[PDB]
Design a protein around this ligand. Structure first.
Ligand SMILES: NC(=O)c1ccc[n+]([C@@H]2O[C@H](COP(=O)([O-])OP(=O)(O)OC[C@H]3O[C@@H](n4cnc5c(N)ncnc54)[C@H](OP(=O)(O)O)[C@@H]3O)[C@@H](O)[C@H]2O)c1
Ligand SMILES: NC(=O)c1ccc[n+]([C@@H]2O[C@H](COP(=O)([O-])OP(=O)(O)OC[C@H]3O[C@@H](n4cnc5c(N)ncnc54)[C@H](OP(=O)(O)O)[C@@H]3O)[C@@H](O)[C@H]2O)c1
Ligand SMILES: O=C(O)CCC(=O)C(=O)O
Ligand SMILES: O=C(O)CCC(=O)C(=O)O
Ligand SMILES: [Ca+2]
Ligand SMILES: [Ca+2]
Lengths: 413, 412
């Protein structure tokens, strides 16, 4: 428990990830690391008991301590309300945290050499900038009960005017309606973060919109990205022999699918949410991806796993059946969190520990110890046997040995 | 001595697609088929001159004649406004036409046994039912100039009282804001058509939504599907050993990517638009996909090609250089329409011809004659020799020649 890590905000999750989260702290972290740990329990029961307040407290605690790591959480619908006897259908804690902090969420696969892909031609990593603010996460949606008029209006703060837009007039029957929004300054921050990540990896930058369909809404993103690139980034982009280009999401997803990778993909909030699942599965597992929210201050960071609570695996866990569930994405939330913490504190010891754990996971997988998903990439699902993989505990305990070995060997040098 | 086809509505496109469209008419359709043809030119320059009225006329024609076929068109942005010197930025004819007719757009890849997929496991078709109505096509978006309150309001027709919801309060600077909607009845028709397609093809049906995030908007789609499923189609699904399941869009796309295919995928408007282009490309080309708008009446269809105008190739075609562009989607637009035109009139010849032009198009590619896109699928693009592919004109000729042979052989 020797390395002094400093202050880190921990957010505990639900279901299968919450079990993995506890195995991670016990086996891979607390033995080697002493942290000043501000822990917020985001499990569904404690959010219900606090009326979601713990979610907001955790977000403000991240603002203060500059780093947080988040386990995956249940976002309840009607069935979850009935399952846990909830008071309300609470909003996504991810959406709540992301809209307080702001910024961009970068998502990238975690690449092992022995792991085949689903998409043949990606030999270089694709990196998704996902705008983290506004759009669907922040939307206001409601059921339209019957005939009537749906309008969306804008009143300036002074208000010396009112601009009223017709959304729809429902002549017979009901339906649904929603408003949504984004902010210029958040878009600008989203652009600056996308361009800088391009130059940081030396790669070109594709931004995708619908702007032919939404002309004002998506046109604003295209305009903001083009103005900033023209004025600020263009000379720098040319000198590295890369470029920035806008593409319609239709073409963009087709291009991304047939390309070789090796590009930064700046997506709007909804697209990045959906495409990072497709991308991560293309490289062969949702268990292998990193998701790191980088805030506009260049200082505060929130790392997480981008996949969910793996309910189906949890259900087998509750019956005593063996599970094989991929912890790697969760482990990398900690390593991405501890590495940014070392950067802020100039802690070489912690920075070394974070990198070593990432290598141990990849080495352990490249050396043939893996969960069932990754073995299914190798053999195909119908060909995998029980002897072909390790259960969730066997795999954590294996990484435990290899992490002890790697840190022991390093102590002699 | 031509087959009499009946009445078809034609909508003509722009750029590269408009060239291929004219090729298919002269070399493929016209010699063998006589048609009562109502031609509406949807080219961007005409839409400007008719103030887009040409597009509403074409849709009403589709209601009247039940059959239409469409070449891809330009939906202008500010750049296109400069290029064509447009009066306004016209909305998408595809959205305009879809929102008049209503329905589910059904999309599926065209499979030639010799063409490798980018995605390893899909050995069976993925058919995406795409809701054609509302959502992003009908949205009202505007620029927020500066600080202030954006609100969404519902005023009932019975005069009870107004509900006003706060969208956002901008306390510094501006942004963008938009409203959007959908209609219960349209969702019900989208549900019914998805359950029927799953039963006729015998495959499981998945619906994908965001319902954990939009709890009302997407919760409605999910409630309606589940209601109609249990009360109407449930016991027929169980009789065919297939199921209906709702999935979060996140989980769904990963489930589709790692599956072997063989399912019906019900998507909301935007999702169906994008996922259909990722799915076509996973099968190896945007050039082979069928897109049919199937209207709720069980009668009218509009057949199109889901891809765009292929502008990049059009710029090369304008340079006189060799363009290889895959006609297949535009051809299958005509055949899917004509097969429907034949199903209505019980015209057995036009039905034989429609399957012939599809059977020919697949055999020409499975014999080694293909456009560059499909050649890159086999050898990879850096390995593609000029000897591997025929250009746009060369390819449409090999089809017309194999078409002449296949129809000549069955006259007997
Ligand atoms: N970041 C977040 O906090 C976040 C994000 C998404 C979803 N969620 C929540 O998670 C809950 C469940 O959502 P969901 O069932 O739609 O999606 P999910 O549980 O995340 O994933 C569904 C399927 O994806 C596969 N999978 C995902 N991660 C895996 C891993 N690490 N190792 C092995 N397999 C993995 C499993 O495949 P197989 O079934 O094929 O074995 C799993 O059954 C919901 O309450 C949702 O709100 C939270
Ligand atoms: N149905 C419609 O009316 C429809 C649908 C979508 C877009 N559009 C319109 O089309 C215009 C341009 O769209 P866009 O530039 O975004 O994309 P696009 O025209 O659809 O095509 C862009 C890329 O897709 C590939 N591609 C698509 N179809 C192909 C084919 N048949 N054969 C060979 N390659 C093909 C090409 O890839 P490579 O460059 O790599 O060779 C091409 O550069 C826009 O104005 C848009 O509004 C119309
Ligand atoms: O918070 C949720 O409910 C979904 C979050 C998610 O899917 C993501 O982070 O990509
Ligand atoms: O009409 C447009 O502008 C795009 C249409 C499209 O890409 C589609 O519906 O597949
Ligand atoms: Ca996601
Ligand atoms: Ca499309």
């Amino acid at each position: 428990k020797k390395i002094s890590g400093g202050s880190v905000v921990e957010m505990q999750g639900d279901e299968m990830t919450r079990i993995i989260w506890e195995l991670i702290k016990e086996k891979l972290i607390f033995p080697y690391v002493e942290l000043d740990l501000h822990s917020y329990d985001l499990g569904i029961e404690n959010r219900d008991a606090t009326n979601d307040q713990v979610t907001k407290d955790a977000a403000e605690a991240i603002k203060k301590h500059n780093v947080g790591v988040k386990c995956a959480t249940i976002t309840p619908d009607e069935k979850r309300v009935e399952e846990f006897k909830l008071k309300q259908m609470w909003k996504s804690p991810n959406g709540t945290i992301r809209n307080i902090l702001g910024g961009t969420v970068f998502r990238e696969a975690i690449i092992c050499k022995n792991i085949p892909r689903l998409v043949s031609g990606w030999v270089k990593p694709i990196i998704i900038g996902r705008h983290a603010y506004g759009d669907q996460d922040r939307a206001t949606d409601f059921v339209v009960p019957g005939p009537g008029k749906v309008e969306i209006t804008y009143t300036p703060s002074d208000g010396t005017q009112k601009v009223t837009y017709l959304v729809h007039n429902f002549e017979e029957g009901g339906g649904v309606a929603m408003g949504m929004y984004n902010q210029d300054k958040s878009i600008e921050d989203f652009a600056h973060s996308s361009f800088q990540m391009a130059l940081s990896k030396g790669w070109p930058l594709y931004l995708s919109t619908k702007n032919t369909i939404l002309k004002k809404y998506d046109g604003r993103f295209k305009d903001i990205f083009q103005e900033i690139y023209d004025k600020q980034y263009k000379s720098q982009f040319e000198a590295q022999k890369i470029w920035y280009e806008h593409r319609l999401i239709d073409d963009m997803v087709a291009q991304a699918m047939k390309s070789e990778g090796g590009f930064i993909w700046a997506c709007k909030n909804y697209d990045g949410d959906v495409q990072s699942d497709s991308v991560a599965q293309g490289y062969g597992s949702l268990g292998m991806m990193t998701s790191v929210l980088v805030c506009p201050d260049g200082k505060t960071v929130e790392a997480e796993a981008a996949h969910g609570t793996v309910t189906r695996h949890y259900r087998m866990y509750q019956k005593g059946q063996e599970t094989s569930t991929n912890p790697i994405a969760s482990i990398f939330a900690w390593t991405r969190g501890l590495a940014h913490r070392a950067k802020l504190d100039n802690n070489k010891e912690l920075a070394f520990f974070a990198n070593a754990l990432e290598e141990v996971s990849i080495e352990t997988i490249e050396a043939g110890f893996m969960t069932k998903d990754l073995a299914a990439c190798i053999k195909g699902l119908p060909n995998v046997q029980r002897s072909d993989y390790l259960n969730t505990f066997e795999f954590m305990d294996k990484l435990g040995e290899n992490l002890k070995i790697k840190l022991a060997q390093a102590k002699l040098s």
